[PDB]
Design a binder for this molecule. Structure first.
Ligand SMILES: CC(C)C[C@H](NC(=O)C(F)(F)F)C(=O)N[C@@H](C)C(=O)Nc1ccc(C(F)(F)F)cc1
Ligand SMILES: [Ca+2]
Length: 240
């Protein structure tokens, strides 16, 4: 997350690390949201390479033992049927991972809350992006879960010539845009948390930044808008 602040051990407890095995060891690739005791929403894009993956729930500091981590292997990766790998801009950038075990719920390991279907955030909705991704353009991944305040820019503004143009769809949330904060590489798959009737609901799954850099003026961070995809989620969990 560029322009972030270390989050607390328990501010965002649906946040998981997707890790892939790296010869001898595991490595952070992407984030995700634990949506059932054994199901993690992430990006289709994260799980695009043929690599062995584990999920880590209870993670705050990657590099150090927190006393709270549960490591569980990914059993099944269900990508959106319509996702084309060579076109993020078509949308559909979402995958559900069934975990080999169901994980223990406790203060560090909770279910993320999903929006209702159809739900569109209003231009300016208070939202937080959370992740271990790069803290600079061409920089380095964070040791400790970070957050940045990332307020929504709606379809109309986001699809003008000045901001994104046709690259962004209404299947999509663009939060941010201010030159200072946004997502960046390694936050992908992660949750956008936005405040709705006293709850933090997950409204986006982190998709893309400009080819040019993470924190770029008039290029918000783009997230798969979860409320579009609710029935697909429910169906994949119901039949699998
Ligand atoms: C493309 C994916 C692997 C996503 C990758 N996303 C991220 O790093 C994250 F976490 F911010 F979501 C990204 O934006 N990387 C930059 C460097 C990129 O290639 N951006 C980008 C790609 C395609 C377009 C498009 F759709 F217009 F072709 C626009 C920007
Ligand atoms: Ca750790």
């Amino acid at each position: 997350v560029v322009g972030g602040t270390e989050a607390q051990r328990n501010s965002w407890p649906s946040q998981i690390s997707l890790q892939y095995r790296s010869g001898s060891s595991w490595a952070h690739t992407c984030g995700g949201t634990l949506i059932r005791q054994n199901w993690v929403m992430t990006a289709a894009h994260c799980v695009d390479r043929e690599l062995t993956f584990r999920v880590v729930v209870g993670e705050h500091n990657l590099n150090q033992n927190n006393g709270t981590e549960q490591y569980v292997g990914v059993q099944k990766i269900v990508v959106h049927p319509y996702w084309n790998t060579d076109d993020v801009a078509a949308g559909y950038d979402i995958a559900l991972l069934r975990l080999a075990q169901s994980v223990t719920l406790n203060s560090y390991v909770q279910l993320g809350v999903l929006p209702r279907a159809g739900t569109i955030l209003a231009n300016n909705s208070p939202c937080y992006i959370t992740g271990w991704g790069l803290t600079r353009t061409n920089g380095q991944l964070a040791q400790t879960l970070q957050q940045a305040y990332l307020p929504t820019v709606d379809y109309a503004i986001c699809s003008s010539s000045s901001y994104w143009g046709s690259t962004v769809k209404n299947s999509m949330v663009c939060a941010g845009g201010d030159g200072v904060r946004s997502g960046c590489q390694g936050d992908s798959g992660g949750p956008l948390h936005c405040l709705v009737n006293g709850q933090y609901a997950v409204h986006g799954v982190t998709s893309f930044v400009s080819r040019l850099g993470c924190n770029v003026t008039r290029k918000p961070t783009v997230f798969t808008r979860v409320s579009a995809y609710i029935s697909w989620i429910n169906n994949v969990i119901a039949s699998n």
